[PDB]
Coordinates of C-alpha atoms and ligand atoms in Angstrom, one line a residue:
Chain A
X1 CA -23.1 -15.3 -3.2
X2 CA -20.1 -17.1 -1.4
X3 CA -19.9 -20.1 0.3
X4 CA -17.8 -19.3 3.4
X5 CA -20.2 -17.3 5.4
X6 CA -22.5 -20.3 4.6
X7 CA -20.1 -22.6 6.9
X8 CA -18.6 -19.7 9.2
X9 CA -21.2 -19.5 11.6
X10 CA -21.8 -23.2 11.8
X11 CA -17.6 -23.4 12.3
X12 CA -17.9 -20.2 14.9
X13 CA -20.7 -21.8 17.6
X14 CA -18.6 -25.5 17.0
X15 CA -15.0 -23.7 18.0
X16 CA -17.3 -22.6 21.3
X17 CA -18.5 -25.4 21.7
X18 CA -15.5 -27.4 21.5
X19 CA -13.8 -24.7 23.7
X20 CA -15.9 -25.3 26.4
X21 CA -15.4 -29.0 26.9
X22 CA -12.0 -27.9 27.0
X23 CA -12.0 -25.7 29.6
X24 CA -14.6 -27.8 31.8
X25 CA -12.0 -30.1 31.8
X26 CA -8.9 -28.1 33.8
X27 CA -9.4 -24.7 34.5
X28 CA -5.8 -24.7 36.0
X29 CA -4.3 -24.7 32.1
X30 CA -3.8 -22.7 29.2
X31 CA -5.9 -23.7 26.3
X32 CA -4.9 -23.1 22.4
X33 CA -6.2 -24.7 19.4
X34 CA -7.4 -24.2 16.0
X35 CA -10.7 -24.7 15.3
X36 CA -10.0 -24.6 11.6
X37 CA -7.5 -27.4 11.8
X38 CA -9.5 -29.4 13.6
X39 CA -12.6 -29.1 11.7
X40 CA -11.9 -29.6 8.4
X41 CA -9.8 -32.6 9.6
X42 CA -13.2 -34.4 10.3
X43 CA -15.0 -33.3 7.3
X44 CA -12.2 -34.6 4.4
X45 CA -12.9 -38.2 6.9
X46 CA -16.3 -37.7 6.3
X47 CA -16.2 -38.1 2.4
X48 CA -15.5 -41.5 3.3
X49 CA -18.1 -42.4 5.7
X50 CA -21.8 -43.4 5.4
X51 CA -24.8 -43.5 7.6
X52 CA -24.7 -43.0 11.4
X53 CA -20.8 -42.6 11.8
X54 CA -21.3 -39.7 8.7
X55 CA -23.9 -38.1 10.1
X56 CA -22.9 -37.5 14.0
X57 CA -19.7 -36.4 12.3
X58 CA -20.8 -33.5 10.1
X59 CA -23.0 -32.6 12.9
X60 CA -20.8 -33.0 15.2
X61 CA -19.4 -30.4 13.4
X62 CA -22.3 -27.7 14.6
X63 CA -24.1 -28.5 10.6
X64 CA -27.8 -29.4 10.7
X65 CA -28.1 -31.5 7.4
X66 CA -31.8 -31.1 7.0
X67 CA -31.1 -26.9 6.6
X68 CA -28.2 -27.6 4.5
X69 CA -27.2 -30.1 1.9
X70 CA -24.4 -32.3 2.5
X71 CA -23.1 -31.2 -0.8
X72 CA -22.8 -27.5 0.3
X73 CA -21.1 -27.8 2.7
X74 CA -17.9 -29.5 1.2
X75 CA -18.1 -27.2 -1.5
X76 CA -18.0 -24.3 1.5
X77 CA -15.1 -26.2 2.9
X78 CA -13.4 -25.8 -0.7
X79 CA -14.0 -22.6 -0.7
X80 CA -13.2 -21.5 2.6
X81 CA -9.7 -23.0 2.0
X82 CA -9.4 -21.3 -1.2
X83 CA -9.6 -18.0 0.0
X84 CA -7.1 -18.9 2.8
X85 CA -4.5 -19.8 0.7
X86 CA -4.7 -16.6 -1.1
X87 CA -1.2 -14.7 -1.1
X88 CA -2.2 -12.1 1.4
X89 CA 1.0 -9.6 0.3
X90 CA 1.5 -8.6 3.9
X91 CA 0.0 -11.2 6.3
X92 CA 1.7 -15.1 5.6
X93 CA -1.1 -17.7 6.6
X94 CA -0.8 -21.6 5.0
X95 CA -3.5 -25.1 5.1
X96 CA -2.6 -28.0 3.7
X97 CA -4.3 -32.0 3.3
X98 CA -2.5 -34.4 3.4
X99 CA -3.3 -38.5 3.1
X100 CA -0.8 -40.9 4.1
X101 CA -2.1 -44.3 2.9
X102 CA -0.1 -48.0 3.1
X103 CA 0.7 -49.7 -0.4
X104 CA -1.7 -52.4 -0.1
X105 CA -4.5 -50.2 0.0
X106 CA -6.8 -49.9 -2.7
X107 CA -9.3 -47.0 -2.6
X108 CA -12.9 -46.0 -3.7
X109 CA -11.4 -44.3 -6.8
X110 CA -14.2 -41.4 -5.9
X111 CA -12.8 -40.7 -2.4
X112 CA -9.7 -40.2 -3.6
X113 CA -10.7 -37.9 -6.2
X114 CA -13.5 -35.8 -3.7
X115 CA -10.4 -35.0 -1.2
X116 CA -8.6 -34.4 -4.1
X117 CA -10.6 -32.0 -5.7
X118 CA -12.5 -30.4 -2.8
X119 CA -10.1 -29.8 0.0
X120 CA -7.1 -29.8 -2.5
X121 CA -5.4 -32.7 -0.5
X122 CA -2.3 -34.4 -1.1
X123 CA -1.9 -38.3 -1.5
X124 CA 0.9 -40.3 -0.4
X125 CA 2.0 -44.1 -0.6
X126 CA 3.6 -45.1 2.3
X127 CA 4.7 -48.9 3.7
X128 CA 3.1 -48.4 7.6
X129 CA 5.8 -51.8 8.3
X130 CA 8.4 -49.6 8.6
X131 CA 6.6 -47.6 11.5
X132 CA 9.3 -45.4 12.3
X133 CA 10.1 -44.7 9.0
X134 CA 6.5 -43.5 8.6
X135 CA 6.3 -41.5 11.5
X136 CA 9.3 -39.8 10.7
X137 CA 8.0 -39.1 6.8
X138 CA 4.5 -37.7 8.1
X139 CA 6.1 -35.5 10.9
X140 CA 8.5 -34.5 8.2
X141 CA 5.0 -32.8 6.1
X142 CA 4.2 -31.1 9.6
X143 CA 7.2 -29.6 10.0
X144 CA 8.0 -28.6 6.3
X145 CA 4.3 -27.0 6.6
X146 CA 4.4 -25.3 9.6
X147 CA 7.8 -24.2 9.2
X148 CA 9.6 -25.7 12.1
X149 CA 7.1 -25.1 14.7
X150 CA 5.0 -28.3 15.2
X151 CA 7.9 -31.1 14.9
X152 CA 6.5 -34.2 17.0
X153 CA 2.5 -34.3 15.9
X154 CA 2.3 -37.8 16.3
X155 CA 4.6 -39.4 18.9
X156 CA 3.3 -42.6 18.7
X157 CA 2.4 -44.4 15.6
X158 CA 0.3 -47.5 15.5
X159 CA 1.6 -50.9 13.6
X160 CA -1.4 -51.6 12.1
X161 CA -2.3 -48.2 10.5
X162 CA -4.0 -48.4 7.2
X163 CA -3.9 -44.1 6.6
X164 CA -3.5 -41.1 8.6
X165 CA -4.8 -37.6 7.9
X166 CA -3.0 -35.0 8.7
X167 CA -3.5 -31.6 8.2
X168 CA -1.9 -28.1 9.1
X169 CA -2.2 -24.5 9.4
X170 CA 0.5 -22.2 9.5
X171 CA -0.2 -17.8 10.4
X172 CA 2.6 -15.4 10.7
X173 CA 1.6 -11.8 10.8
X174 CA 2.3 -8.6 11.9
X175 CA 0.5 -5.9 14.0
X176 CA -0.5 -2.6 12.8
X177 CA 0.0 -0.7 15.3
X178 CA 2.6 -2.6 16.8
X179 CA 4.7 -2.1 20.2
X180 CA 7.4 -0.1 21.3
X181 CA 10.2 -2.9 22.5
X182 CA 11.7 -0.7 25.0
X183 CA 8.6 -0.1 27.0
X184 CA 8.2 -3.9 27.6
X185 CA 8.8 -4.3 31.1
X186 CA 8.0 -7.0 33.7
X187 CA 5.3 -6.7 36.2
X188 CA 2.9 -9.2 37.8
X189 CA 0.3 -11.2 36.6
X190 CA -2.4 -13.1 38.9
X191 CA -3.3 -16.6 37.6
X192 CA -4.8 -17.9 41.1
X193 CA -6.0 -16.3 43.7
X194 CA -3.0 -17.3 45.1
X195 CA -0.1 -18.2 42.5
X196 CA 1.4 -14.7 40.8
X197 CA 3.5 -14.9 37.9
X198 CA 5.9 -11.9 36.7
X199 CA 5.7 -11.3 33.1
X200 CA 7.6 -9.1 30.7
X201 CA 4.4 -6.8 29.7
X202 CA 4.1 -5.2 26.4
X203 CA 2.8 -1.5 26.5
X204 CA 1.1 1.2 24.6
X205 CA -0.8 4.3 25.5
X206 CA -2.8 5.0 21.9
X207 CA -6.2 4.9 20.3
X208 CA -7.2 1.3 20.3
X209 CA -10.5 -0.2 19.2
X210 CA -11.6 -1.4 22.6
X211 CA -14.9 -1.4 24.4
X212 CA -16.2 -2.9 27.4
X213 CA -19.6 -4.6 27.5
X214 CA -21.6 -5.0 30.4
X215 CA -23.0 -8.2 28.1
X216 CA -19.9 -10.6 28.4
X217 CA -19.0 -8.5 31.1
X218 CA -15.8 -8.0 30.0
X219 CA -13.3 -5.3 28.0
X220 CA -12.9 -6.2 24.8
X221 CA -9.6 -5.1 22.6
X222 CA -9.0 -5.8 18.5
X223 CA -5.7 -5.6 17.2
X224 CA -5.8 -5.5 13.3
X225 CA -2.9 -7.4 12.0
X226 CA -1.1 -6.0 8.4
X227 CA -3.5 -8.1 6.1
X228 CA -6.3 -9.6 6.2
X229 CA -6.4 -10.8 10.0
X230 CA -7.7 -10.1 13.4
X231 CA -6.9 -10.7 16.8
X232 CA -9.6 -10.2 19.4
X233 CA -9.0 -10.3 23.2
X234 CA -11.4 -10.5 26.0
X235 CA -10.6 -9.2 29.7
X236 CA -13.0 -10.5 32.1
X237 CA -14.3 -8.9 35.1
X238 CA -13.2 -10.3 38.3
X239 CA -15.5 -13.1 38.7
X240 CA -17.3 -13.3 35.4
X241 CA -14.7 -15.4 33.3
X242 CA -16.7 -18.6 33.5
X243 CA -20.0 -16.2 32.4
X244 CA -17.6 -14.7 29.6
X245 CA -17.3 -18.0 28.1
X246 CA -20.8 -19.1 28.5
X247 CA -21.5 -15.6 26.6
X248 CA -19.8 -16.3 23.6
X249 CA -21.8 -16.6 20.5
X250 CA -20.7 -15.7 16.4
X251 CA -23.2 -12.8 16.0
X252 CA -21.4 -11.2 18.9
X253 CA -18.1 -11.3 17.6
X254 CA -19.6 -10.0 14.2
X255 CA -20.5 -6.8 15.6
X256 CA -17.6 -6.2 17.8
X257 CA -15.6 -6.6 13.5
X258 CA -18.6 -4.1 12.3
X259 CA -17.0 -1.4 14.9
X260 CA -14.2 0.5 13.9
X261 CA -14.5 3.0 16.9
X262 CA -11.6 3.6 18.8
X263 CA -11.2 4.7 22.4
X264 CA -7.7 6.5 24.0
X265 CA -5.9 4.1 26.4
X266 CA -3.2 2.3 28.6
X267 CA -2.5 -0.8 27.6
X268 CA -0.6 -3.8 29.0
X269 CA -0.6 -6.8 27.3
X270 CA 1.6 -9.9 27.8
X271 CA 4.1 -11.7 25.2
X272 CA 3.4 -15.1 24.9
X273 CA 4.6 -18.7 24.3
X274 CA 2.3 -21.4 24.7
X275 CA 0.6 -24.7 23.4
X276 CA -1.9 -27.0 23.6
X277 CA -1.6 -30.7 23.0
X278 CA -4.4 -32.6 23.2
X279 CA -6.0 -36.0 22.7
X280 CA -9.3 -34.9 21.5
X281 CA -11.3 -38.5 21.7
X282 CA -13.3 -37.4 24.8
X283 CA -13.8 -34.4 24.2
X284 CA -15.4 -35.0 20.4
X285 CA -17.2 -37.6 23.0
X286 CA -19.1 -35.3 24.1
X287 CA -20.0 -33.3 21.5
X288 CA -21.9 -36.4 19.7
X289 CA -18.6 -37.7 17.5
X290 CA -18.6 -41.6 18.5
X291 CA -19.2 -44.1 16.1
X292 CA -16.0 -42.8 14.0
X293 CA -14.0 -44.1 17.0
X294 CA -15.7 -47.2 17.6
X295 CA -16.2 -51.1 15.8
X296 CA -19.5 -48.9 14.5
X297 CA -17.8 -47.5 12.2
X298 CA -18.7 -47.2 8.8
X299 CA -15.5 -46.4 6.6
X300 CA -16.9 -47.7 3.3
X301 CA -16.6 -44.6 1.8
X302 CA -12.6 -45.2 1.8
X303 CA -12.0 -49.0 1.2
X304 CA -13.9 -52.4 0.5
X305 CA -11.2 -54.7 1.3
X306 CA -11.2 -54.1 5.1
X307 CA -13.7 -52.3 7.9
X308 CA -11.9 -49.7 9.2
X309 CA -12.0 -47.3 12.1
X310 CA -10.5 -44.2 14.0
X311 CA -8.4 -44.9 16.6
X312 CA -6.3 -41.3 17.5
X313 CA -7.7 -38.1 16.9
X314 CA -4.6 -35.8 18.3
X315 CA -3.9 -32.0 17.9
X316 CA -1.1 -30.0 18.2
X317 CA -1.2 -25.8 18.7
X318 CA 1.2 -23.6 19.4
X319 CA 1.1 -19.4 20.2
X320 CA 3.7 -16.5 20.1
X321 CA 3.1 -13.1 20.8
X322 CA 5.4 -10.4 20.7
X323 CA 5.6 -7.0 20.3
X324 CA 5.8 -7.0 16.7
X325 CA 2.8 -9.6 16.2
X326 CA 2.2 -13.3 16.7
X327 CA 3.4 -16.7 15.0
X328 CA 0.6 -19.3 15.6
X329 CA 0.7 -23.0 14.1
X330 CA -1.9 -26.3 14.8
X331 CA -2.0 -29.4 13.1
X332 CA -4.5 -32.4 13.3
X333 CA -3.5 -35.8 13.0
X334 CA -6.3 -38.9 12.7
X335 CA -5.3 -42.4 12.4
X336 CA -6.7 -45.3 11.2
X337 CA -6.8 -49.1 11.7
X338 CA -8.7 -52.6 11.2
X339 CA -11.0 -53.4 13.5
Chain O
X1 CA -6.5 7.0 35.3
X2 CA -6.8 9.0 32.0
X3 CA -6.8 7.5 29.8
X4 CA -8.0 4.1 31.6
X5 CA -6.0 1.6 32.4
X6 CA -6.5 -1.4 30.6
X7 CA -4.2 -4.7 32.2
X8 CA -4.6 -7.8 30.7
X9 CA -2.5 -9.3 33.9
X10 CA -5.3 -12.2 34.4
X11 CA -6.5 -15.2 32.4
X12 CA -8.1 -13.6 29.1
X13 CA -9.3 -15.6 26.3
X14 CA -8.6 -14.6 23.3
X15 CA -8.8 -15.5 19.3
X16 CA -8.1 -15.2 16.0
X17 CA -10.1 -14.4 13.1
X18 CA -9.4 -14.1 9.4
X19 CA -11.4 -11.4 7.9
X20 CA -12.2 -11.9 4.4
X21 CA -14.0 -15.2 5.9
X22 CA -14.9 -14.1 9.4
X23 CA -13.8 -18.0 10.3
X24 CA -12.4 -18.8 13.5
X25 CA -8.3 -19.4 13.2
X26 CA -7.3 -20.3 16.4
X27 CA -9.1 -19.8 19.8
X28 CA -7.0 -19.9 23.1
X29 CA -7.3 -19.0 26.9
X30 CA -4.4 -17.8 28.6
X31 CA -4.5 -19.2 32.7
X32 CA -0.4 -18.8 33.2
X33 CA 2.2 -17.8 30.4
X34 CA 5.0 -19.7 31.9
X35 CA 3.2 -22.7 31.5
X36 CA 4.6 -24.3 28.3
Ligands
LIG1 C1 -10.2 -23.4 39.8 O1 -11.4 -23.6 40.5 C2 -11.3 -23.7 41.9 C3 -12.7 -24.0 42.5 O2 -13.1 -25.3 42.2 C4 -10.7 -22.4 42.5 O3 -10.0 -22.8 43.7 C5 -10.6 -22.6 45.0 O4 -10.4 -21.3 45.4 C6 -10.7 -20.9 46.8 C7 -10.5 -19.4 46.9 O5 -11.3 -18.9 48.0 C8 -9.8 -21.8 47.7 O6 -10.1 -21.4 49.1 C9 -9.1 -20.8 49.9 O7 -8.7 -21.5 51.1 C10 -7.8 -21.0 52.1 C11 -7.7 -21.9 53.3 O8 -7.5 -23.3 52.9 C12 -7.9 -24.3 53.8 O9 -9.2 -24.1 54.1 C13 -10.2 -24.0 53.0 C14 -11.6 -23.8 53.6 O10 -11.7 -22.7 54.4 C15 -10.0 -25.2 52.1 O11 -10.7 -24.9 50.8 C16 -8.6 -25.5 51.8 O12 -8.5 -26.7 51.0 C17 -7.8 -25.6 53.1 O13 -8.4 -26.6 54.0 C18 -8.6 -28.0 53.7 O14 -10.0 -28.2 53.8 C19 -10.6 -29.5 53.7 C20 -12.1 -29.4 53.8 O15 -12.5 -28.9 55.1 C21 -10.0 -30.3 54.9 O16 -10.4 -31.7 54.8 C22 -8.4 -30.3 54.9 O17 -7.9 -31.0 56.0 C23 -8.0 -28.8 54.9 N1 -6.5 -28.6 55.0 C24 -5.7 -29.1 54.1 C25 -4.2 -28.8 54.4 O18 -6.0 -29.6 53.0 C26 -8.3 -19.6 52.5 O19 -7.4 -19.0 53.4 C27 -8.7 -18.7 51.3 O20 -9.3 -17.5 51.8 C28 -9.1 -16.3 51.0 O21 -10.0 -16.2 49.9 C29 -11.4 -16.2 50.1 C30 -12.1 -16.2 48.7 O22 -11.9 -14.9 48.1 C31 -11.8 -15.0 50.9 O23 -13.2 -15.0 51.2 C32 -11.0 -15.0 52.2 O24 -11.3 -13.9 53.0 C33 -9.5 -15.1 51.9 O25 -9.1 -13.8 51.2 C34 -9.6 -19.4 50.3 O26 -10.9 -19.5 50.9 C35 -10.1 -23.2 47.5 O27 -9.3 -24.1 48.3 C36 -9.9 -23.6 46.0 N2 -10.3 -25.0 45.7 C37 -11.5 -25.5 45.8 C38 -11.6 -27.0 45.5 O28 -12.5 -24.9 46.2 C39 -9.6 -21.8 41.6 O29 -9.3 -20.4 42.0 C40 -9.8 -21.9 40.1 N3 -8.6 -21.6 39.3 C41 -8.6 -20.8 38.3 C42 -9.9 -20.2 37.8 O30 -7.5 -20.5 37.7
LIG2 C1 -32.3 -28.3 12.2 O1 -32.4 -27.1 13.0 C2 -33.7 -26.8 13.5 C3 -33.6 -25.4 14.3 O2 -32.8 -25.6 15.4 C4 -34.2 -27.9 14.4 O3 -35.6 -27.8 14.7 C5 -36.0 -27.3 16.0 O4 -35.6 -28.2 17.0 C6 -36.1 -28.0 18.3 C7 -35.5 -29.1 19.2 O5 -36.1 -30.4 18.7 C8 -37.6 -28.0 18.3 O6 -38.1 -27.7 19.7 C9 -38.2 -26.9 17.3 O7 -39.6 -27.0 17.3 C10 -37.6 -27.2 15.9 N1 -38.0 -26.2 15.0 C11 -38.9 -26.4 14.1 C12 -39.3 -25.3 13.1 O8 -39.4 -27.5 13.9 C13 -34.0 -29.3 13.8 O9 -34.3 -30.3 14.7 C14 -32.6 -29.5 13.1 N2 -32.6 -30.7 12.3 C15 -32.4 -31.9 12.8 C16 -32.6 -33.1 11.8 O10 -32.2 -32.1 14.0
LIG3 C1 -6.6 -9.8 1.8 O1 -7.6 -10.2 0.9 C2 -8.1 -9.3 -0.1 C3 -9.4 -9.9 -0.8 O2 -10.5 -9.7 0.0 C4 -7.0 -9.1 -1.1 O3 -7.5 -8.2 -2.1 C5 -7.5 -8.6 -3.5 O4 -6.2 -8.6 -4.0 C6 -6.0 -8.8 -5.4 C7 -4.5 -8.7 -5.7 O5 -3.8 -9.7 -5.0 C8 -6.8 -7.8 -6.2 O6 -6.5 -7.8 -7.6 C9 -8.3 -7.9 -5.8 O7 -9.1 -7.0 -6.5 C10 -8.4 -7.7 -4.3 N1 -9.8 -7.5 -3.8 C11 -10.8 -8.4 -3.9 C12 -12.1 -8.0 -3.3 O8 -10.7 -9.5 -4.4 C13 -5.9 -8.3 -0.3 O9 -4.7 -8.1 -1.1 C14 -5.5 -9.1 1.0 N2 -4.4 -8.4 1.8 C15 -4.4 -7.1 2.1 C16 -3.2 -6.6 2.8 O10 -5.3 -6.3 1.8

């Protein structure tokens, strides 16, 4: 019957495939993002496109339009982001749309009404002359949403802006089987073959789910949060991290959620503080998504009175993991212009 | 050791799932936790 595992998979292998234009980029950085945040960020803009620009975009996306109706998958995404925003009693996990448009505007009554409707967005009038003023009122949304932990999404706001998109997504859970604080101690931890960093390390010597397969060559751990989440680590064997990434694939993580076994162990695992901030026009480059960005661009869907395009397409992520659970926030933030 | 010895003391990648949906949350890698 439902919609969501009629997107997920398509979402899943995207994520990966994202991921690893990421990481062929530096492999001398952390990475973190938020494949959700992202991704329905480009599919509310693509209500308001037509032809080429619309179609590299949704499949862009990982969708191949000919198996699925365009239709679907919107009302997937509307789905998907229904069930998200459910109140989960134990586990606290927040989306939210937003439009920033300038006064003058005047809009394809329908494309306001789709976002509206579909990905439950929220529209706002705002006067892009007083750029700073602007910025500050669509950081404000960012940092009301994610509760204080994305604060400075976009940095640098264009004069000529017609609208910005902006999204969020805000998780806050806890562990079930969550660690002992006073057996956190610091110890090493080998980023290079020749740079070692000493981290407090979190321990526990319990029944965990874990597993190794030969496969991805790798351990594999899952750490059920209270609620309706799931955090899933991979430990690569020494030498097989780049195979480990080339390995990934949905179906495989869809087994490893079908297991339930658990195995006695000694484990060490980090606490964490990081983010990624990233300007994702070249890498969406590569994965097909062009025309969106150039004087292609086909924004018809949005507005008669001028040809618009993209111009940013910036996102912000940010990680913390301690030993009671983790606090993880993205937001993505497109921009656009005249030509 | 018994029962093994499982360190997570090198980049992992790592990701979060919700479960009702089985969608990708967030995916991350970490190379050095320091780096912020
Ligand atoms: C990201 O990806 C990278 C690969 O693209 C990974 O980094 C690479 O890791 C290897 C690890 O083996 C490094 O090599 C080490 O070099 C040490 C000696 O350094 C001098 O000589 C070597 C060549 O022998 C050279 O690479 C160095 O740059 C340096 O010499 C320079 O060489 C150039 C070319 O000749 C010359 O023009 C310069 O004049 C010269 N000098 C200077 C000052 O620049 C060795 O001692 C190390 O040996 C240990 O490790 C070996 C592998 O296990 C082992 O077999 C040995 O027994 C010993 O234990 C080692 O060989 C590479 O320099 C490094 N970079 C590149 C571009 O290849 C990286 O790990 C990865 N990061 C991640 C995943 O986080
Ligand atoms: C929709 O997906 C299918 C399956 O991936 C694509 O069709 C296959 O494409 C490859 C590469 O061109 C071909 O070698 C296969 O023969 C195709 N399968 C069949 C049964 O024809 C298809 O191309 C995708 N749709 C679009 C419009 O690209
Ligand atoms: C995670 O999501 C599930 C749904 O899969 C939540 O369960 C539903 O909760 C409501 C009450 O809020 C019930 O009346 C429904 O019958 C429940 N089940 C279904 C299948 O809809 C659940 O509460 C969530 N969180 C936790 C901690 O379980």
């Amino acid at each position: 019957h439902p919609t969501f595992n009629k997107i997920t998979p398509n979402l899943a292998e995207f994520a990966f495939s994202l991921y690893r234009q990421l990481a062929h980029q530096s492999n001398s950085t952390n990475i973190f993002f938020s494949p959700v945040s992202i991704a329905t960020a480009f599919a509310m803009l693509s209500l308001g496109t037509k032809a080429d620009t619309h179609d590299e975009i949704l499949e862009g996306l990982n969708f191949n339009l000919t198996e699925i109706p365009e239709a679907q998958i919107h009302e997937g995404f509307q789905e998907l982001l229904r069930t998200l925003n459910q109140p989960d009693s134990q586990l606290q996990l927040t989306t939210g749309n937003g439009l920033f448009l300038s006064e003058g505007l005047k809009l394809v009554d329908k494309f306001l009404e789709d976002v509206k409707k579909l990905y439950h967005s929220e529209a706002f009038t705002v006067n892009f002359g007083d750029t700073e003023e602007a910025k500050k009122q669509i950081n404000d949304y960012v940092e009301k949403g994610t509760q204080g932990k994305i604060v400075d999404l976009v940095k640098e706001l264009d004069r000529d802006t017609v609208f910005a998109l902006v999204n969020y997504i805000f998780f806050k859970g806890k562990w079930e089987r969550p660690f002992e604080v006073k057996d956190t101690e610091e110890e090493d931890f080998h980023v290079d073959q020749v740079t070692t960093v000493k981290v407090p390390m979190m321990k526990r010597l319990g029944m965990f789910n874990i597993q190794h397969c030969k496969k991805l060559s790798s351990w594999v751990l899952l750490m059920k949060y209270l609620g309706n989440a799931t955090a899933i680590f991979f430990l690569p064997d020494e030498g097989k991290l780049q195979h480990l990434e080339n390995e990934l694939t949905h179906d495989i993580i869809t087994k490893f959620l079908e297991n339930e076994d658990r195995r006695s162990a000694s484990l060490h695992l980090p606490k964490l503080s990081i983010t990624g901030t990233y300007d994702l026009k070249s890498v969406l480059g590569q994965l097909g998504i062009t025309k969106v960005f150039s004087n292609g661009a086909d924004l018809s869907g949005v507005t008669e009175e001028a040809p618009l395009k993209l111009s940013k397409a910036v996102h912000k992520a940010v990680l913390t993991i301690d030993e009671k659970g983790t606090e993880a926030a993205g937001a993505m933030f497109l921009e656009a212009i005249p030509m | 050791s018994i029962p093994p010895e499982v360190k997570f003391n090198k980049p992992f990648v790592f990701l979060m799932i919700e479960q009702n949906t089985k969608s990708p949350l967030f995916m991350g890698k970490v190379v050095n936790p320091t780096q912020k």
